[PDB]
Amino acid sequence: VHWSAEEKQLITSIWGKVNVADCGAEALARLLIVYPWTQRFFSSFGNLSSATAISGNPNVKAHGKKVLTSFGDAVKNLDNIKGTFAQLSELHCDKLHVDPENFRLLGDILVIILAAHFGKDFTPECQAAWQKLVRVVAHALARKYH
Amino acid sequence: VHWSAEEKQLITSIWGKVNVADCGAEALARLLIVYPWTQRFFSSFGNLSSATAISGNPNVKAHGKKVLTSFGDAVKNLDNIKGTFAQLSELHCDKLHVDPENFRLLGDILVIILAAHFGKDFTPECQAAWQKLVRVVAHALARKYH
Amino acid sequence: VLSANDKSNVKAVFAKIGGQAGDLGGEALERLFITYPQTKTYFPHFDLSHGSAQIKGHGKKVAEALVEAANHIDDIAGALSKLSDLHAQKLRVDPVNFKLLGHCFLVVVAVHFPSLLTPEVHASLDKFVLAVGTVLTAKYR
Amino acid sequence: VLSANDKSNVKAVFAKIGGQAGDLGGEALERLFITYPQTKTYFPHFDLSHGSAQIKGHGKKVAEALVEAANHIDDIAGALSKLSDLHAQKLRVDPVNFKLLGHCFLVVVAVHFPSLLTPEVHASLDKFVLAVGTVLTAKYR
Numbered sequence A, B: 001v002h003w004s005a006e007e008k009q010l011i012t013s014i015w016g017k018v019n020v021a022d023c024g025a026e027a028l029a030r031l032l033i034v035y036p037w038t039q040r041f042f043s044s045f046g047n048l049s050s051a052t053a054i055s056g057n058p059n060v061k062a063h064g065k066k067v068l069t070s071f072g073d074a075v076k077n078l079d080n081i082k083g084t085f086a087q088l089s090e091l092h093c094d095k096l097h098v099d100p101e102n103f104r105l106l107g108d109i110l111v112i113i114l115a116a117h118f119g120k121d122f123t124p125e126c127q128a129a130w131q132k133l134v135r136v137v138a139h140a141l142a143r144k145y146h
Numbered sequence C, D: 001v002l003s004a005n006d007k008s009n010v011k012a013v014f015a016k017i018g019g020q021a022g023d024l025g026g027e028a029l030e031r032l033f034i035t036y037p038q039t040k041t042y043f044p045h046f047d048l049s050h051g052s053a054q055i056k057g058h059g060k061k062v063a064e065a066l067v068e069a070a071n072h073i074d075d076i077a078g079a080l081s082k083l084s085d086l087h088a089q090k091l092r093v094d095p096v097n098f099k100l101l102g103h104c105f106l107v108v109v110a111v112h113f114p115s116l117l118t119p120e121v122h123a124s125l126d127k128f129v130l131a132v133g134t135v136l137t138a139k140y141r
């Protein structure tokens, strides 16, 4: 992966300004609502039995914040994403057995969440840069395979 | 990617008995017939008008042999698959714009072709090693992407 | 098949923003081409320059098909009959690309109508765009 | 949709397999767990050791269901409706795993009946196992 000055600016600016708590909670809730098989991995989180329940679930909300904070670790060193996600890759692959397609789905959800948060400031170029970022992150998490 | 002695032996022993012309003809015909959108990439190959025409097409046969010979280059140096396929990645990604999912589908087809040819010698462990090989090749071919 | 609830969510969405759907289609397509540049190779006969009237014209048509599908949501296959043979038989569009365009449509909806796109509505719209993509690629399966 | 020729091909395959179906189901499942180890996560209540009687017994159930789908190939959704509820609502099986198992079934057919699995019959059987997977994931749509 190569990052242009323009891509770095688009990524860093959105990160600085994003509400990490609210957008992280939103991304996780939407993953669980839109793609409900993902609920299987979160059975310790309690009530996931409705969209309302998922969105109000304090464990979902707190975990969502952790997740977007972790995407923040990608932002902070864009040329070291592989290393940043090595330990998380062991977790998600070897321990939790999450198929990598779900990393793609969460990336797509995050893009939609950012689009909602930023409106027209989330230009097509901004979208391009962020979809590139979530794809790089997903690639780094799906390593302990191939 | 790490390859055990056992995995290496399952791969090379099968490969030593592969007829690349026959297996390659089978694999490419099956790609074009089973996943017909792939025909888009092979417009210059002539008659792809029916399943029968595709199996009888000499250009499909010839190209199939080249594809299998290439898989042979992976078998010959399992630890250097990334390097071996770097140039082919330029061709497939930057010039042909083949979505990587199609590399997975061709891999699955190759596994079925080997199963058909080798029958009871294509044990579950042999299948696991070959599926691993085709995934590692696919990831090498997709290198030019994320 | 889409549930009664999903159908109502789709109709609620297009009944509100159907007037803008044409413009939204143009933007969705612009975003497809910029976010996933490989998709431009399906359009070598278009002017794919940013701003281009052909992109805008064509996105308008994509959105109008979605609106037709919404208006006849109980038989989307029927509604989009010609279009299906077009995409799978004639054009041989790789099925992966339908999820990319459907996602771009959701992105445009989020950009312009954030309070409309609740998680429930997002779920229903995702199912809808996938149902359309499935109809258009039906000959593959 | 499955064409008439696809249906002929599928029924021919299952007629050939005949009473071996149960055993081939066990083999498909054994291959699933060995080739795609992540799938073992769904069976923590099973003995999953090599040779496991529980794997073989379960494979027979899977093959019984495929046989019924072949016998009712004109309406797979109808025949397997409650199986879909089980897999999607109760078990929350990731949709990707249906493609993996379907593939394992084709591999088993290839091992045992290579002359039957021509490219055309391969295409028909692929469409079949994908149609079954699509039915079983229905409650995700």
Ligand code: HEM
Residues within 6 Å of the ligand: A038, A041, A042, A044, A066, A067, A070, A071, A088, A091, A092, A096, A098, A102, A103, A104, A106, A107, A137, A138, A141
């Ligand atoms: C692709 C981007 C993803 C990122 C950046 C991410 C990030 C994280 C982080 C930072 C943790 C905390 C690790 C710890 O406490 O040791 C975590 C845990 C976890 N993740 Fe992810 N994740 C991603 C995708 C997914 C997906 C797609 C799923 C399931 C569909 C998933 C399921 C889980 C589960 C079940 C946990 C453990 C939760 C717990 O019990 O505390 N993750 N993830």
Ligand code: HEM
Residues within 6 Å of the ligand: B038, B041, B042, B044, B066, B067, B070, B071, B088, B091, B092, B096, B098, B102, B103, B104, B106, B107, B137, B138, B141
């Ligand atoms: C994943 C394993 C694959 C391997 C090992 C492979 C191998 C090759 C090789 C060795 C060549 C010839 C390069 C040359 O002659 O200089 C080639 C060309 C080509 N490949 Fe692949 N390929 C793979 C997958 C695919 C797939 C999945 C598609 C499309 C769905 C595809 C489409 C093509 C096309 C269109 C050409 C050019 C043929 C021509 O000369 O017109 N390849 N490939």
Ligand code: HEM
Residues within 6 Å of the ligand: C039, C042, C043, C058, C061, C062, C063, C065, C066, C083, C086, C087, C091, C093, C097, C098, C101, C102, C129, C132, C133, C136
């Ligand atoms: C649900 C998603 C989609 C919808 C509703 C849709 C809709 C349409 C419509 C209404 C047309 C009619 C143009 C005409 O009649 O001249 C068309 C044509 C076309 N579509 Fe799509 N489409 C979709 C997805 C895609 C995708 C994913 C691609 C490829 C990336 C694609 C590529 C094309 C091309 C190349 C044409 C011919 C354009 C022309 O020559 O004017 N479509 N589509």
Ligand code: HEM
Residues within 6 Å of the ligand: D039, D042, D043, D058, D061, D062, D063, D065, D066, D083, D087, D091, D093, D097, D098, D101, D102, D132, D133, D136
């Ligand atoms: C071809 C697609 C499949 C078919 C036809 C099928 C069929 C079946 C049948 C017939 C049963 C239980 C019989 C009964 O209770 O009456 C079952 C249960 C089950 N299936 Fe599947 N299945 C398929 C795919 C999958 C996949 C891909 C997975 C996960 C990787 C899976 C996981 C399970 C689990 C965990 C059970 C419960 C088993 C138990 O508690 O003993 N199934 N399936």
